[PDB]
Amino acid sequence: TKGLVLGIYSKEKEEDEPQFTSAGENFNKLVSGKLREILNISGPPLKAGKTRTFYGLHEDFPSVVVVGLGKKTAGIDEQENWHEGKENIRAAVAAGCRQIQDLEIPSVEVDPCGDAQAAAEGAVLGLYEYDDLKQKRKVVVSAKLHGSEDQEAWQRGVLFASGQNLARRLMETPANEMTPTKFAEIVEENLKSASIKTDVFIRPKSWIEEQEMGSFLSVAKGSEEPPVFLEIHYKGSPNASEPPLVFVGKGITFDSGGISIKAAANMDLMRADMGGAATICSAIVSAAKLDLPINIVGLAPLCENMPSGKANKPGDVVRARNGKTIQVDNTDAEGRLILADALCYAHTFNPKVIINAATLTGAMDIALGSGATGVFTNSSWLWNKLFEASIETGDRVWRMPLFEHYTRQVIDCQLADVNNIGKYRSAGACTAAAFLKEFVTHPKWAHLDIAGVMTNKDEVPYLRKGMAGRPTRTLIEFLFRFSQDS
Amino acid sequence: TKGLVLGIYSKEKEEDEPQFTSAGENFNKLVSGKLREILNISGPPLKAGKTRTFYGLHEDFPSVVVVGLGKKTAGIDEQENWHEGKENIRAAVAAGCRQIQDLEIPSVEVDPCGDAQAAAEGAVLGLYEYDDLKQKRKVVVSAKLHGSEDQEAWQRGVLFASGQNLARRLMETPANEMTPTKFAEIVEENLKSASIKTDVFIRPKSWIEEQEMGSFLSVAKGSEEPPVFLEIHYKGSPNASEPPLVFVGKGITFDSGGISIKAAANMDLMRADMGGAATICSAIVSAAKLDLPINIVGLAPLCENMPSGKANKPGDVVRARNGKTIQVDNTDAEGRLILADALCYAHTFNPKVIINAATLTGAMDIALGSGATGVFTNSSWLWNKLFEASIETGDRVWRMPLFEHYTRQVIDCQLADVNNIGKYRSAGACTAAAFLKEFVTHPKWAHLDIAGVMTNKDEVPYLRKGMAGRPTRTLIEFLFRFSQDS
Ligand SMILES: C[C@H](CS)C(=O)N1C[C@@H](Sc2ccccc2)C[C@H]1C(=O)O
Ligand SMILES: C[C@H](CS)C(=O)N1C[C@@H](Sc2ccccc2)C[C@H]1C(=O)O
Ligand code: NA
Ligand code: NA
Ligand SMILES: [Zn+2]
Ligand SMILES: [Zn+2]
Ligand SMILES: [Zn+2]
Ligand SMILES: [Zn+2]
């Protein structure tokens, strides 16, 4: 059994009937107009993201799912900050593929819908499900481009989507499996499979201690799970000495909050508190697969945050790699602690830019939810590049303020140079960002608080319920454009 | 006794000593160099916002307070989104005036510090205190410009600051005094004192019922305090038919949350839940005092949100003026309910723009705190105008997303067209904004969630602890520039 997903646009006022994509019209022609005929008979027109299934139209395609693509000329939506057409395609195709999968069809050919990359992303992101630990699973669906004219674009979409799906897998996987060591090993095998122009160092605790990362170590010690500092190098630049772009990701494989223990409700989701590491590492893996002509370094401090007889204690003062002391008033604000040391280390690479990602604050979720990743940056150039890339990917970013106003609230510290929690409970994502900035001197640094986009329920149509792996594609697009432009 | 506030800048590397402002150097000359001499003797240089008091330098000024103005050439700070020099002046002067007041001196002359408006704002905003109900009060200080060359700029500052102080007074005043009726009467007398080219209508409940404002009425009915719909007109345009700019403000004189009752802790601050009305009305009063050549309409639905035998009940469905039904799942999300009707009414004026302000969500506070007012708008032109004005005033704004992503979460309603609370608890300010947008069809609408800037502790140096009256000056500046530019 082989399924087929075909797109149809919303009817324009000047048109007598909704128009099929080129593939749709061709298939209709192939079946002597039976597709149009049955679609007409089926009832109301298919709107954006809606689907309808027709059976027995062609011996090779017992199941044909037509999906609504919305307005054919839908481009950049000035109000939504994204290319609407691409988003329509991703959603429609995802919906179509899910329908094919529900019919238990193992193979599906997908209409490029005028944008093969978007179509591929919809199919690949849409079909993804982390079901490795389930006895009962949906049929594995192999999605392929319908036709052979948009191959590179289609594969580009598969690549981008696969990068995000890698992040989703890493985030979704339970923490007892996805330990710091396991995460590092999976990223290592993926990066090495992507290109041999790579180096991966799964730095052990001894190295971390040697690097004087007391902040990171303070978080890790509460747990019996060994911490690791993942360092990955992708040497894509023609010039080996070319300064690299450095990505840093919060890799808390599991966050119980530590002594400042979290509430039980939905704490299981904290297995994705390493989403920052997942997204930046996956983006680098994808950059390597794209063979981007740039040098990139990925840094991911990985550990668990657990309560125990040797765990971080509220009030404890720890020393970051840069010598700055930190008062750990709340052990559940551990992401900024490990990032302090990772960000310090990031400067040793004399990077062109430093971008960190982290499921850093619930405040970010309360601020923008899953609508967009919050971006704190001291460079409007960098903000604009990330923003422009997000318009293309649809995985939106929204700028958040890096004001001294917030810095003042974290450096007002009773015992040390900086407190790991603001003196007020307001603007949690902003004070967390201000804290990170105290460990950054680089002129082009961007902090992405992805706590709000850590999961998906139904907000992003082409992502099934679960860890979202956002905004991996936006980072990939950013890297791609940087390798071409910047 | 008459005090004197003089400014001194931070020493530049090329300078041999920190430089006084023109007024400072002149005074020093007047006292034969004794000011410089004593300042030198006093110790370390005065940094931005710091002050030092010197006594007996001149028979007419027994107390002279020198204040640090920071870098003389401090201009627009690209990272802080404000004119740093103006902010330095406001803070320094406020500090100086507070010192003069502590010395119980009733009159103070203030150095224009190279920017008389900023100096005036610092003095007027800085000295303000709502102490009408206190037996023990600080000495009333009369601040005046030192010299007579920067009079218009100084008075402009006093005007802007007075506008904000009016908002602060309205917000700070206890709700049993600042009732809907009282608020309306105070705004009325202030607007009428500002210009005779005005009309004020304190619309009674009967009018509100006539206007079919069922949403607004649903909120008000729980309380015995009569609701009023304040409608103010400022006819500043040379052309009476010139479309007006319409401002709308949430005027909940007191919010107990209603049946969805609030927690006791700090609920007293909800006497400022009419801050939206306070800021937009005050801005209009100030626009009138500035005699801006534009037509402006101010709309402020005013009422209390109280629990009682006839109060809004969770689940109740009310009908807005535009016929849209609203499911009131949480009676404490009442601001959007009254704004729905006010925003609908705003369209009847065929306005050029519609800007509403409201202490709408705690989510906004969690998002940006008092760092900046969150601005939701469907017009980048409008956003940019507000942003540019905020750079000048220092009362910053930060854009927040108006995405369908959030709309979907409020129109997913069990009983009606729209639910007054999102289906998820994330992005509270965004879903609240999305709710408002369902009552807006205008192409240039901006919603300002000022919940985070409702109060000040010490974030804004020139504002004493209490209701902040923000971002009144930014609205005034916006209006001023619009009357000149747009
Ligand atoms: C998503 C983050 C990172 S794991 C997180 O859970 N935080 C960070 C801080 S916020 C915070 C909460 C209360 C007082 C001070 C800060 C602690 C914890 C929390 O919200 O209680
Ligand atoms: C500042 C605002 C306006 S008065 C406010 O207090 N809200 C608005 C809503 S948010 C909300 C809270 C829980 C569920 C749904 C929405 C209710 C109340 C609150 O936070 O509990
Ligand atoms: Na995980
Ligand atoms: Na009040
Ligand atoms: Zn935590
Ligand atoms: Zn965490
Ligand atoms: Zn309320
Ligand atoms: Zn309220």
Side-chain angles (χ1 to χ4, degrees):
Chain A
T1 18
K2 176 162 273 183
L4 178 60
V5 173
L6 297 177
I8 190 172
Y9 298 106
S10 301
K11 194 186 75 62
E12 294 299 326
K13 185 182 179 181
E14 298 181 60
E15 311 176 316
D16 299 80
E17 70 188 340
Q19 298 298 299
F20 283 119
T21 55
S22 179
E25 189 52 59
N26 289 320
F27 182 78
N28 181 54
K29 182 183 65 182
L30 179 63
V31 297
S32 305
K34 295 300 180 179
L35 177 58
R36 173 69 69 178
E37 176 180 296
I38 195 65
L39 176 57
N40 281 165
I41 289 175
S42 67
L46 281 171
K47 291 190 173 181
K50 297 299 177 181
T51 77
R52 200 165 302 162
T53 305
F54 303 114
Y55 304 105
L57 293 178
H58 189 289
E59 61 187 303
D60 297 323
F61 297 108
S63 288
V64 172
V65 183
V66 178
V67 305
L69 299 180
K71 191 182 186 63
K72 188 182 187 305
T73 57
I76 296 180
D77 186 324
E78 197 188 320
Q79 305 295 169
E80 299 293 341
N81 292 165
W82 63 18
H83 188 295
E84 170 175 30
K86 292 178 189 292
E87 274 295 299
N88 283 167
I89 295 172
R90 298 187 182 99
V93 172
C97 291
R98 296 197 311 267
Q99 178 59 60
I100 289 299
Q101 180 173 50
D102 191 50
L103 278 160
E104 293 170 31
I105 300 170
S107 296
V108 66
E109 280 186 37
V110 185
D111 183 339
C113 301
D115 193 321
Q117 175 170 176
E121 302 176 322
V124 180
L125 291 177
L127 283 169
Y128 184 79
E129 286 189 309
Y130 174 67
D131 54 14
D132 284 5
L133 314 177
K134 285 176 159 295
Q135 185 182 305
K136 298 179 182 178
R137 311 172 180 178
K138 293 187 178 62
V139 176
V140 177
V141 177
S142 172
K144 292 185 178 178
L145 172 63
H146 180 61
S148 56
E149 291 184 55
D150 310 289
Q151 299 185 51
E152 190 175 319
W154 173 270
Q155 288 308 310
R156 191 171 196 274
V158 175
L159 185 156
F160 271 59
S162 296
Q164 185 170 342
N165 286 347
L166 174 57
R168 298 169 73 189
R169 166 194 167 191
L170 297 171
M171 291 171 74
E172 197 74 68
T173 302
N176 60 318
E177 171 54 34
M178 191 57 59
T179 60
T181 300
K182 189 64 178 182
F183 174 97
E185 302 181 318
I186 297 177
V187 169
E188 172 175 45
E189 58 175 44
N190 274 273
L191 175 59
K192 292 188 173 178
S193 295
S195 62
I196 67 174
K197 306 169 183 176
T198 56
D199 271 310
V200 174
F201 303 103
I202 302 179
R203 313 292 194 185
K205 184 175 181 180
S206 61
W207 181 89
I208 300 170
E209 301 177 316
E210 176 192 67
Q211 287 297 312
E212 304 184 306
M213 299 186 167
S215 188
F216 172 27
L217 290 170
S218 73
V219 177
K221 67 182 179 184
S223 170
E224 283 303 295
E225 188 58 46
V228 300
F229 189 105
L230 178 63
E231 187 181 328
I232 64 180
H233 300 177
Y234 166 58
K235 303 161 289 185
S237 178
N239 170 43
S241 65
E242 194 60 44
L245 288 76
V246 174
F247 282 56
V248 181
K250 169 184 175 180
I252 295 295
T253 55
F254 187 75
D255 187 17
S256 68
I259 296 301
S260 300
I261 204 164
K262 293 175 175 298
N266 304 116
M267 202 203 298
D268 67 279
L269 297 177
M270 294 314 296
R271 60 176 175 283
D273 204 30
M274 34 58 70
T279 53
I280 66 100
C281 284
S282 294
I284 294 176
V285 166
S286 298
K289 290 207 65 178
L290 285 170
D291 185 61
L292 301 186
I294 55 179
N295 288 330
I296 314 174
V297 171
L299 303 178
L302 295 140
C303 71
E304 299 183 337
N305 188 26
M306 298 287 275
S308 74
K310 51 194 172 190
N312 249 166
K313 298 171 302 303
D316 282 358
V317 172
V318 300
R319 178 178 180 288
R321 183 175 189 286
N322 69 350
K324 190 176 299 295
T325 53
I326 303 164
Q327 184 173 329
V328 184
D329 266 357
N330 187 309
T331 69
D332 195 11
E334 84 300 321
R336 66 197 76 183
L337 297 183
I338 76 174
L339 286 171
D341 283 328
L343 286 169
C344 283
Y345 186 58
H347 291 71
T348 69
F349 297 95
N350 182 52
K352 296 192 175 185
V353 308
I354 298 182
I355 298 176
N356 75 265
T359 45
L360 206 64
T361 66
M364 191 63 243
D365 180 69
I366 295 177
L368 304 176
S370 57
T373 291
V375 176
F376 293 83
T377 179
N378 59 351
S379 168
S380 293
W381 170 83
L382 184 47
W383 154 250
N384 285 301
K385 289 302 182 179
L386 292 167
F387 177 63
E388 299 182 328
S390 77
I391 294 176
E392 178 77 357
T393 70
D395 205 333
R396 305 179 286 190
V397 296
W398 193 268
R399 198 176 188 173
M400 293 293 277
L402 271 183
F403 295 163
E404 179 281 332
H405 173 292
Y406 305 111
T407 298
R408 185 186 176 190
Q409 301 183 189
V410 296
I411 58 175
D412 180 42
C413 186
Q414 182 70 26
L415 311 170
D417 298 330
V418 63
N419 195 295
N420 86 321
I421 63 169
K423 55 179 177 179
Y424 306 132
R425 57 188 182 184
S426 307
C430 300
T431 50
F435 176 101
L436 297 183
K437 191 171 68 173
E438 290 304 294
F439 298 92
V440 173
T441 60
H442 196 285
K444 288 181 172 57
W445 164 63
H447 155 53
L448 281 54
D449 193 330
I450 62 167
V453 303
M454 187 179 86
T455 69
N456 191 64
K457 292 145 197 172
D458 70 328
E459 306 97 301
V460 182
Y462 50 89
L463 298 178
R464 279 172 155 150
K465 178 182 179 183
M467 304 310 178
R470 300 171 59 189
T472 302
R473 289 182 299 115
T474 292
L475 293 179
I476 297 171
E477 186 57 32
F478 165 77
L479 289 174
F480 166 68
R481 300 190 174 194
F482 183 103
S483 73
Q484 299 282 55
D485 301 57
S486 310
Chain B
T1 18
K2 176 162 273 183
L4 178 60
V5 173
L6 297 177
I8 190 172
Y9 298 106
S10 301
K11 194 186 75 62
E12 294 299 326
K13 185 182 179 181
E14 298 181 60
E15 311 176 316
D16 299 80
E17 70 188 340
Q19 298 298 299
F20 283 119
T21 55
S22 179
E25 189 52 59
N26 289 320
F27 182 78
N28 181 54
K29 182 183 65 182
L30 179 63
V31 297
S32 305
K34 295 300 180 179
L35 177 58
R36 173 69 69 178
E37 176 180 296
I38 195 65
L39 176 57
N40 281 165
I41 289 175
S42 67
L46 281 171
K47 291 190 173 181
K50 297 299 177 181
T51 77
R52 200 165 302 162
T53 305
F54 303 114
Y55 304 105
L57 293 178
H58 189 289
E59 61 187 303
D60 297 323
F61 297 108
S63 288
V64 172
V65 183
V66 178
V67 305
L69 299 180
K71 191 182 186 63
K72 188 182 187 305
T73 57
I76 296 180
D77 186 324
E78 197 188 320
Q79 305 295 169
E80 299 293 341
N81 292 165
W82 63 18
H83 188 295
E84 170 175 30
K86 292 178 189 292
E87 274 295 299
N88 283 167
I89 295 172
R90 298 187 182 99
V93 172
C97 291
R98 296 197 311 267
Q99 178 59 60
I100 289 299
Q101 180 173 50
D102 191 50
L103 278 160
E104 293 170 31
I105 300 170
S107 296
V108 66
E109 280 186 37
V110 185
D111 183 339
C113 301
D115 193 321
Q117 175 170 176
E121 302 176 322
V124 180
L125 291 177
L127 283 169
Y128 184 79
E129 286 189 309
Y130 174 67
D131 54 14
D132 284 5
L133 314 177
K134 285 176 159 295
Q135 185 182 305
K136 298 179 182 178
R137 311 172 180 178
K138 293 187 178 62
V139 176
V140 177
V141 177
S142 172
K144 292 185 178 178
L145 172 63
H146 180 61
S148 56
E149 291 184 55
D150 310 289
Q151 299 185 51
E152 190 175 319
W154 173 270
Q155 288 308 310
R156 191 171 196 274
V158 175
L159 185 156
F160 271 59
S162 296
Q164 185 170 342
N165 286 347
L166 174 57
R168 298 169 73 189
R169 166 194 167 191
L170 297 171
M171 291 171 74
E172 197 74 68
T173 302
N176 60 318
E177 171 54 34
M178 191 57 59
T179 60
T181 300
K182 189 64 178 182
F183 174 97
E185 302 181 318
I186 297 177
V187 169
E188 172 175 45
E189 58 175 44
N190 274 273
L191 175 59
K192 292 188 173 178
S193 295
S195 62
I196 67 174
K197 306 169 183 176
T198 56
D199 271 310
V200 174
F201 303 103
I202 302 179
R203 313 292 194 185
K205 184 175 181 180
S206 61
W207 181 89
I208 300 170
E209 301 177 316
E210 176 192 67
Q211 287 297 312
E212 304 184 306
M213 299 186 167
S215 188
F216 172 27
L217 290 170
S218 73
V219 177
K221 67 182 179 184
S223 170
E224 283 303 295
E225 188 58 46
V228 300
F229 189 105
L230 178 63
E231 187 181 328
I232 64 180
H233 300 177
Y234 166 58
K235 303 161 289 185
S237 178
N239 170 43
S241 65
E242 194 60 44
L245 288 76
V246 174
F247 282 56
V248 181
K250 169 184 175 180
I252 295 295
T253 55
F254 187 75
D255 187 17
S256 68
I259 296 301
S260 300
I261 204 164
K262 293 175 175 298
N266 304 116
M267 202 203 298
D268 67 279
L269 297 177
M270 294 314 296
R271 60 176 175 283
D273 204 30
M274 34 58 70
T279 53
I280 66 100
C281 284
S282 294
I284 294 176
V285 166
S286 298
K289 290 207 65 178
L290 285 170
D291 185 61
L292 301 186
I294 55 179
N295 288 330
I296 314 174
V297 171
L299 303 178
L302 295 140
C303 71
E304 299 183 337
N305 188 26
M306 298 287 275
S308 74
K310 51 194 172 190
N312 249 166
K313 298 171 302 303
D316 282 358
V317 172
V318 300
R319 178 178 180 288
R321 183 175 189 286
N322 69 350
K324 190 176 299 295
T325 53
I326 303 164
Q327 184 173 329
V328 184
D329 266 357
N330 187 309
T331 69
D332 195 11
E334 84 300 321
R336 66 197 76 183
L337 297 183
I338 76 174
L339 286 171
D341 283 328
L343 286 169
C344 283
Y345 186 58
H347 291 71
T348 69
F349 297 95
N350 182 52
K352 296 192 175 185
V353 308
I354 298 182
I355 298 176
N356 75 265
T359 45
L360 206 64
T361 66
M364 191 63 243
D365 180 69
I366 295 177
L368 304 176
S370 57
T373 291
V375 176
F376 293 83
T377 179
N378 59 351
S379 168
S380 293
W381 170 83
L382 184 47
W383 154 250
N384 285 301
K385 289 302 182 179
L386 292 167
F387 177 63
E388 299 182 328
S390 77
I391 294 176
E392 178 77 357
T393 70
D395 205 333
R396 305 179 286 190
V397 296
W398 193 268
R399 198 176 188 173
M400 293 293 277
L402 271 183
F403 295 163
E404 179 281 332
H405 173 292
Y406 305 111
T407 298
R408 185 186 176 190
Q409 301 183 189
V410 296
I411 58 175
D412 180 42
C413 186
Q414 182 70 26
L415 311 170
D417 298 330
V418 63
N419 195 295
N420 86 321
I421 63 169
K423 55 179 177 179
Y424 306 132
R425 57 188 182 184
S426 307
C430 300
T431 50
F435 176 101
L436 297 183
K437 191 171 68 173
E438 290 304 294
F439 298 92
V440 173
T441 60
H442 196 285
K444 288 181 172 57
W445 164 63
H447 155 53
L448 281 54
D449 193 330
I450 62 167
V453 303
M454 187 179 86
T455 69
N456 191 64
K457 292 145 197 172
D458 70 328
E459 306 97 301
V460 182
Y462 50 89
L463 298 178
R464 279 172 155 150
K465 178 182 179 183
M467 304 310 178
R470 300 171 59 189
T472 302
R473 289 182 299 115
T474 292
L475 293 179
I476 297 171
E477 186 57 32
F478 165 77
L479 289 174
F480 166 68
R481 300 190 174 194
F482 183 103
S483 73
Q484 299 282 55
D485 301 57
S486 310

